[PDB]
């Protein structure tokens, strides 16, 4: 739903990044090597790979040389990528019309560190993965940091300055780790198309920046007051995720020397299906998406036998307390090129 | 898989001799070495450590930067020197899996003998099944069967070789191990004991009215156990690879270090059921499988006194030609 809208918004940035690769004759290499990192997109992963497939086919059809092939690395691969495998594998598709063969591989492991040999990647795509951290900020998980962000699970208006500082610091570290890892693996002049969950305002405590996590904390606090969750637990737990601003992303990429910013863009989208007339169906659909992306870290924290009652309260807060309206979600599009190198 | 365990110890010398022959050429100071395990089924995780161990030794002798190792795994069923990255490759190994010129090494153990399908031409005209009472080449079976089977294996193995030809780099190495046979006649008990016995078990249930004969008569396994000569000829017909070594070795089929025949027979049947039931179950259901391998075990433990012929494995070492 929302994911679909984000994916289409980033598609032109993906096209141009392929175009730039062509201007450096990447289409004349024996094979183009593409990776999709954090394949949790996705469904929307099929569109981006089909798009690379198609742009190569258009480019190479007038070339006298033997037609280049496409090698696709998919990471997150949980064996459910079979729908993408069967849809993109040119041997499985069996289309004799296609001149560009596509070979699809699974890459196990974390997008945070190394996944491939040196100079093995020409193009990296990653959508809504890079804002995830390796852990809750270290300054928040020390013996005395467990006390800083009391009734919440993320940067909030109630958070002392140390909280957002810790998060930015953790992001700086984890994102630089990523950049460093990719820098080893992305070929000189290679491209990277990153899309992530960010924010508009410079202040992270702003609702538009934190609403999803703020509302979840309010829901957890409800069950806490009702005596169903230990609060222990609320006060010591913080989310392993950060939504940076444009400026923060720029800063970190520029401090790291490895990549050049070809494109840095933010854009806003509605956070719920505003075309939906049923105020309950609107929030329920939103909550379902939220649950799909957040239940792993959350149920791990509070147990699974409380996830139903928890996400129900979350939906009730969205529907009733907020009249099925939320601030708009900001997404960041970051296109990078590996410097030579 | 205590049997497989013994097979991989015997082919590991032939794996070392071959991987090291990729160090005689250079082929020594490259960025990253790409190796594929095609039809994996812990031994695939053993051949990986072998490659890593060998590479690190040849580099420390050559005083050069250590390449990284990328391993591709196509599934059918701290102070380490060489950086290894492992990748999963879905898809059939009889077709293309990799870009051209991308593999330095290919390993495949006990997968190549599996056919893409049970042989095509097994019905006459008339309109009779050409392999009644059985599920593989047998003594009762007319010549047409073993010819259909060899033809199917010819086609399938040649497709494999053909695909690999595109992907294996010039002078790149292929190590293939497969279930073969000693005797030139593929209907010898040495060649087909497992399938023969399985048929005998099924035919027992048929006479008891538990399984249609329909059924037995129209089913045949998607497997073929070739001879050294058949393997050699097919490889030579295809023009892509050089036969560096081609050798067969014998192995005891049952755990013979066990005096209790019914125990060593069960162990055998348990093993046989693990790799044959998925091949058999579509045609005969899972329902009758308990009574099927029950009867199979009695045919093994009683009628043959837990004495089965040795299994022949073929070790095939290849090099890409240009």
Author numbering:
A (entry chain B): 29 to 104, 106 to 370
B (entry chain A): 28 to 68, 71 to 106, 125 to 369
From the paper:
Here, we identified three N-methyltransferases involved in the biosynthesis of caffeine from the leaves of Kucha. Combined with enzymatic study and kinetic analysis, we found that one of the N-methyltransferases, CkTcS, serves as the critical N9-methyltransferase, which only acts on 1,3,7-trimethyluric acid but not caffeine, indicating that C8-oxidation must take place prior to N9-methylation. The structural characterization of CkTcS identified key residues around the substrate binding pocket that are critical for N9-methyltransferse activity. A previous study using 14C labeled caffeine has confirmed that theacrine is biosynthesized from caffeine, possibly initiated by oxidation at C8 to yield the intermediate 1,3,7-trimethyluric acid followed by N9-methylation.
